[PDB]
Amino acid sequence: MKLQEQHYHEAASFLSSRLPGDAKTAIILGSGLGELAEKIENKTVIPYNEIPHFAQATAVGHKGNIIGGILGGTPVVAMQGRFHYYEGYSMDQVTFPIRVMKLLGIENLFVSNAAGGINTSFKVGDLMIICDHINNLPNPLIGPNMDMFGVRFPDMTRAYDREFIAKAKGIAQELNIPVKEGVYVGLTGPSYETPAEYKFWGQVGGDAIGMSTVPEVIVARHTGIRVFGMSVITNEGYHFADDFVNDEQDVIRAANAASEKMGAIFARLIAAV
C-alpha cells in the first residue's frame, strides 16, 4: 500500500540525481531499435540493473539502459530495451518504468516496437503509426488502484494522441519517409502466431501484431502521459511460403534496417511536441 508508492519514489530519486531533469519526452526503443541510442547526444547511460526496483531485462536485442541526453536538439530520456510479459514479469514489473517516468516529469511517451504485419498491404520495412490498439495481454491496472498515478477506470478513447499523429505525418511528408497507419494488437507471445491467429486478428481489425506496448500505453494513459507509437513491420503474417519460418534474428535485422528512418521521425517529433 505505502510500500509500493515508496518503490516508485526510490527509483525516481535515483534517476533524478543522475539525469539532467529537463526532459519532458521519453522514448521506448524496441527490438530492432536499441541502436537509436547512437543518435542521442551527451548520453548519461544508467543500466536497469543499477536502478531500484527495475526488472533485469532478458529479451534478446534488449540492452536494458536508461539513457539521458539530447535528441533533435531536445532533452530526452530513453528506455534502451523494454520489459515484456512473456519474460515472466508481472504487469506491475513490466510497466514500472512508466510510472517512474511520470515522477521524473515526463509528459510525452514515444514508443516503438517490432510488429508482424497482418494488413496484407504492409510489407517488411514499413513504418506504421499506431492509431489504436487491441489488448490481449492481462490488463496492467488489475489490482488496487494507485491513486497517486490516476483514476480507477481510465478512458482509452484516444490512447494515441491525435496531435502527435498529425505532427508525425506532417514530419514524415517533410522527410520523404512513407508511413502507414493502423491498429496494433498486443499478444503475450512468446511463440509467434499461427496462420489461424494471424487471420483472426486481421479479421477483427488488427493491422500489426506484437508482444509489448499496450501495457505501457495503458499505464501511460492512466497517468496522463501523451502517447505516440510506431511499429516497424518486421515480417508478414500472411502469404506464407511452404517453408517460411519467423525468426528472432530476421525480426531484429529488419528493425535494424528501419531504425534510421524511424529515428529521423522521432528526432523531429521530439522537438515539435
Add this chain to the structure above:
Amino acid sequence: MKLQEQHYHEAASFLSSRLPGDAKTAIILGSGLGELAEKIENKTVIPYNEIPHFAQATAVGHKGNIIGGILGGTPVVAMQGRFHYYEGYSMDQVTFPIRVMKLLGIENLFVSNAAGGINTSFKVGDLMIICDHINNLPNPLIGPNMDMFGVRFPDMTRAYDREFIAKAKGIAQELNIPVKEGVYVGLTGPSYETPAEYKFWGQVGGDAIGMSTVPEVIVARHTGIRVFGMSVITNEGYHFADDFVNDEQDVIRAANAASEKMGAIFARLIAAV
C-alpha cells in the same frame, strides 16, 4: 479442499443466523444501482467486512452489504455492491458470495450491471436483458472442482433462464418500459475499451460490455441457480466525438438515472419467479 467447504459453510452459517431464511431469490446491485436497496422493506443490513471470508468491496460506487428484506412482497437477499476481478481478487473471492447464496437456499439470482453499448441501437439509458454472454475474464471454475457445488464441466447453453426473460419482457410491456435484449461481453477492465476493442467485440456478436457478471453467472449455473440478468447502458462505445472521454461518475449517474425503471422490473419479476 474441505478447507474451502469449511469456508463456505462458515459464511453461510453466519448469514443464516442474521437472515430470515425464506428468500429464494438473490439480487446483485451493480454500479448504477445501490439505490435499489432503498426499495427493500424491513431491511437487515450485513456489512461484507463482518461476514467470514467475504472480500471487501473496493470499487467506487459499490457499498458492500448483504441486505435481506422484502422486495415486491417477496423475500430477498441482495448484494449491495459486488466484487470485480479488476480489484485484484481471485475468481474464487469474486464469486464466493454466489456459493454462499446457494447454501442459504437461493434458487434464483438477478444480476444487474452497468455496461457500455457496442451495438449502435443501444443508447445511454437503455435497459438490456442479458440473453447470453461471452466470457473474456478468467473462468471462475479453473482449479479442482468443488463437487459439493456442481459438476466439473457445467453446461452453459442457456445460462440466462428463458422463462425469466419471457416474464421480464412481459413485465416491461406492462410497465411500458422499453427494453433491449442482447449479448453481454465481460472483460477484466479496469481501463475502458479502445474504439478498436469496442469494434472488435461488436463485430463478433456483443451488444454491451462490462467488467463483471460473467464470473458470477458461470458459478451460479455451475450450482444450478437460475439466472436473470439486465444491463443499464451507461455510455456508448461507438460514434466517438473527437473529445469524448469515458468516465466513472458519468457511468454511475447514468445507472442511477435508469435505476427506478430497473427497480420496477425487478420487484415485479421477483414476485413472479
Add this chain to the structure above:
Amino acid sequence: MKLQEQHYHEAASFLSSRLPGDAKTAIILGSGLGELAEKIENKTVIPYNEIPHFAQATAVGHKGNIIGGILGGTPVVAMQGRFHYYEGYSMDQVTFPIRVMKLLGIENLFVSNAAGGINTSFKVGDLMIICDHINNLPNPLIGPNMDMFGVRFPDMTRAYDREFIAKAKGIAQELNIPVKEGVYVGLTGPSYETPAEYKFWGQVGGDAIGMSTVPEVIVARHTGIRVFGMSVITNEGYHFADDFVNDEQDVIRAANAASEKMGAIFARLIAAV
C-alpha cells in the same frame, strides 16, 4: 533456471529405466480415448503418480499412465490421459511430459482430444484432422526460456506437420474412414461454451473447440517435435435444441464410439512416419 533442467532429467531418467527406449513417436490419448491403450501390445504401464514431478491426472476419463509398447507394429509411448489448465495446474505442469518425451528421444507427437464442433458440417462422431489452432489459453512458454529445449520465440507457421496430414489423409482413404479437416480452438474451460462463444469462434475461423492440446503443441513445436493432431467431434456447438445440454459423460460416450476408427488411423500413421 538451473533447478528445472534437473527436474526434466529426473523424470526422463526414471522413465528411461522402465521403457526400452526405441520409441520415436508418442501419443496423447484424451477424453474417452484412454481405451485406445488396448491397441498397444507388450505394455509397460507407469502410473503418473510414480514419475518424478508429473502432476496428478484429475480429469474424469483421464487415468494418468505412461504406457510403453508396440502399436502399429511400432514402438510407441502413450500418455493415457492428459493434464489440463482447467485443473489448476500451471502450464509448466500441464506441458512437463512433452519436454520429458523430448529427453526420451521422441521426435513425433500424435495428439488426440475430444472437441465441440463449431463448423456446421462437422457432426457428432466425426474425426477432424487439426491443420491449425487458435490459442486462447495462457501461452505455456511465458517466463524464462529453457534454452536446453528451444529458442525464445519459436515459429508456429506450420505447427501441424504437413506430411503427417497428407499421410493421415491417404490412410483414412484406404481404411474408408471419412475425415474432416480444420482449426482447433483451445479454450481454458472447464464450463462448456455459451452459444454466443461458439458463434464467435466459428465466425473467426475456428472449426472445433476444446480445453487442451494447444499448450502441448506449442511446447512440442518449441523443441522440434513434429506434431499430428486429431479431434473427435463429441458434440455440436450449434443449432441448439431448446433443452439441450452438454454433458461430460455424453462427450466421453461419443469419443468412445469413435476410438476404434481413430486408433485404426493412428496405428497406420505411426508405422508410416
